[PDB]
């Protein structure tokens, strides 16, 4: 999971 | 009918997907791997709802503004509604073009009734996948  | 939008026009309308994955290094923004899966699922989902789906990949801020402005000047008389999905990095009130930030309001405002007569009285839906800040939600036990 990465953040935008 | 007074309580429900008329959704039985000859066309459902456009679903416009702006899928920004690769960013100019001067922005310092990381490549958004996984977003192509989002765009693929969206095109399938919204095609199944009757939309004419258009996918745009890696648009600058100027390209995003000009793309939506052209669409705002088309003839929507026979369309039920308009849908736009933005897939990008963002902050509160802003999303990234490949070259820099743009206000969300600069994009939504192109479709206000005073500028897009053939969408007056019809739903204008924007789905926005982007951060809105850097707070973390740790949750609560339930």
């Amino acid at each position: 999971d990465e953040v935008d | 009918l007074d309580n429900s939008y008329k959704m039985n026009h000859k066309r459902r309308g456009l679903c416009l997907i702006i899928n920004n994955k690769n960013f100019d290094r001067k922005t310092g923004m990381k490549t958004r791997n996984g977003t192509d899966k989002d765009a693929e699922n969206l095109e399938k989902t919204f095609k199944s709802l009757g939309f004419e789906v258009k996918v745009y990949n890696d648009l600058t801020a100027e390209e995003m503004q000009e793309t939506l402005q052209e669409v705002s000047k088309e003839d929507h008389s026979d369309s039920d509604c308009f849908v736009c999905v933005l897939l990008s990095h963002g902050e509160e009130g802003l999303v990234y073009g490949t070259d820099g930030k743009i206000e969300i309001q600069e994009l939504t405002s192109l479709f206000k009734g005073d500028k897009c007569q053939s969408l007056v009285g019809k739903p204008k839906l924007f789905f926005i996948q982007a951060c809105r800040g850097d707070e973390l939600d740790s949750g609560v036990e339930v």
């Binding site: 999971d1 990465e2 935008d4 | 429900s4 509160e92 996948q129 740790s138």
Partner: protein, 85 residues
């Protein structure tokens, strides 16, 4: 005999004002994949508010850093919206 210039907009955000929004590099963003799941199963039957509330619920029951995400939608719609088949 006019209507507001801001009438009949709906903005569905992946996350709450001020917060991060998560993207899985294999499967896509939490919000879009939940949106598509709910639209694929219920989209020809439920009103748009019911749809987006189920999306809220679906995203609220996920994890990972072990963090959480709460989508938020803002409605200036004036009527019920059905994607009638």
């Amino acid at each position: 005999h006019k209507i507001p210039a801001e009438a009949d907009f709906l903005i569905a955000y992946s996350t709450a004002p001020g917060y991060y929004s998560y993207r899985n590099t294999s499967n896509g963003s939490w919000f879009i994949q939940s949106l598509c799941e709910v639209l694929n199963k219920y989209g020809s039957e439920l009103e748009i508010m019911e749809i987006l509330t189920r999306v809220n619920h679906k995203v609220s029951l996920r994890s990972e850093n072990g963090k959480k995400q709460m989508p938020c939608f803002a409605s200036m719609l004036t009527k019920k919206l059905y994607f009638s088949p």
